[PDB]
């Protein structure tokens, strides 16, 4: 119904990225607080922005988890990529984890310039990872340059089973794939011999 140059009809298409499910993770947004990255049709990660923490200790027993080797390898890869993509992460107490029984629970404590804080780096990483539908929960307190601030105190990542969660944004692999190149790009040195 929209004709250009009298002879060119403007037509559209929308890709069903859901069909990529077997070969790459797909992230989507359910609402402001709930976002998902699914791996196949059986498992995935739920990422929740929330004021309610579920971990109240300072441990993240990554090496023991590796030794026990009970987790889903793809999910551990996604966790590793997310954490390695955070810029200027320098407060190890802000990250707590539970990996017992092969489960994955990771909790980033966003409480507190706001730019040079773990909250800013973690939330920028979350914006990239959950790209599409992140914007509604993000940049409530507008910061300088690319800086992000929200009113949430925690970002929680836990494993979950497949469900039709993509009410706000369509599933897409773009965020994960884009974050793959960000890995280790902005990590600080913590010792002389890496």
């Amino acid at each position, epitope marked *: 119904t929209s004709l250009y140059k009298g002879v060119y009809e403007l037509q559209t298409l929308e890709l069903n990225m859901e069909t990529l499910n077997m070969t790459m993770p797909l992230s989507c947004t359910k609402n*402001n607080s709930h976002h998902y990255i699914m791996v196949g049709n059986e498992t995935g990660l739920e990422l929740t922005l929330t004021n*309610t923490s579920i971990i109240n200790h300072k441990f993240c027993n990554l090496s023991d988890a590796h030794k026990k080797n009970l987790y889903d390898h793809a999910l551990m890869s996604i966790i590793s990529t997310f954490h390695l993509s955070i810029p200027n992460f320098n407060q190890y107490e802000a990250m707590s984890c*539970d990996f017992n029984g092969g489960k994955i629970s990771v909790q980033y404590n966003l409480s507190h310039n706001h730019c040079g804080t773990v909250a800013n780096g973690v939330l920028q990483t979350f914006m990239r990872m959950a790209w599409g539908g992140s914007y509604i929960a993000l940049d409530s307190g507008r910061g300088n340059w690319d800086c992000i601030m929200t009113s949430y105190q925690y970002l929680i990542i836990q494993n979950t089973t497949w469900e039709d969660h993509c009410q706000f944004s369509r599933p897409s692999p773009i965020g994960y794939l884009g974050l793959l190149s960000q890995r280790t790009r902005d990590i600080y040195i913590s010792r002389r011999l890496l």
Partner: antibody, heavy 124, light 106 residues
Framework: QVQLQESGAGLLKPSETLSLSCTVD????????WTWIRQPPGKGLEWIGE???????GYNPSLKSRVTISVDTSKNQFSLKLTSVTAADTAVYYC??????????????????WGKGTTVTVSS | EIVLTQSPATLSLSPGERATLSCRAS??????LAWYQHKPGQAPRLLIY???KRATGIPSRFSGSGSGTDFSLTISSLEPEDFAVYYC?????????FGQGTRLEI
């Protein structure tokens, strides 16, 4: 339909250890803060503490050194131990299911399912 | 730490009257308060949560309001079974606190 059944001896002598357990039948076990509260005679409600399915805990400071709360997810139960009980620990003890919503403002929290309650008295 | 002070200590009211109970927080609340009713010989019952939402089975005569540091529970036309002790409760991260309670009697 959710029930919480509380078990544990309520007849104690000073310096002993109170051991209570609460079993949950009905609905899920994750995502709730399983909570211990107590009411001393002639007093109000007093929060003892809470625990979730990851064994993360929160305790009332005034009892921290003496209180331990544990969980057993295999049979959906959670337990409270108070060591070296003195006369200040005589009270009715309740287990309760707490739910916290922190996904949007206003956040809220409540204890919606309560157990019957166990009287605990310490004397010589 | 956030504490809750309830007002007044006790209330003397007749059936059919309007009951208003206040809860004051020492600072702006981390989450909206909840209100419980407690009678001797039985467990406390959740009446209100989120400062304005009735729990399951709570009659419509129970209402709530408030924000910041000031919260209130209202019984429009109080029934004879509404005479009990009422508690406001708050939760910050991994810390739950109760108000001292208000006694509502005939």
């Amino acid at each position: 339909q959710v029930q919480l059944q509380e078990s544990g001896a309520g007849l104690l002598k000073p310096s002993e250890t109170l051991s209570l357990s609460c079993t949950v039948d009905g609905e899920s076990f994750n995502g709730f803060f399983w909570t211990w509260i107590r009411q001393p005679p002639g007093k109000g409600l007093e929060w003892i503490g809470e625990i979730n399915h990851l064994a993360s805990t929160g305790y009332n400071p005034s009892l921290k050194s003496r209180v331990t709360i544990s969980v057993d997810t295999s049979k959906n139960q959670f337990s409270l131990k108070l060591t070296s009980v003195t006369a200040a620990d005589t009270a009715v003890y309740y287990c309760a299911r707490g739910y916290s919503y922190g996904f949007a403002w206003p956040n809220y929290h409540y204890l919606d399912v309560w157990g019957k309650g166990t009287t605990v008295t310490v004397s010589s | 730490e956030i504490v809750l002070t309830q007002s007044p200590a006790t209330l003397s009211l007749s059936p059919g009257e309007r009951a208003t109970l206040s809860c004051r927080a020492s600072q702006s609340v981390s989450s909206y308060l909840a209100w419980y009713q407690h009678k001797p010989g039985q467990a406390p019952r959740l009446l209100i949560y989120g400062a304005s939402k009735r729990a399951t089975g709570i009659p419509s005569r129970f209402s709530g309001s408030g924000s910041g540091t000031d919260f209130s529970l209202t019984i429009s036309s109080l029934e004879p079974e509404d005479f009990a002790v009422y508690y406001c409760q708050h939760r910050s991260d991994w810390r739950t606190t109760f108000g001292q309670g208000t006694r509502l009697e005939i």
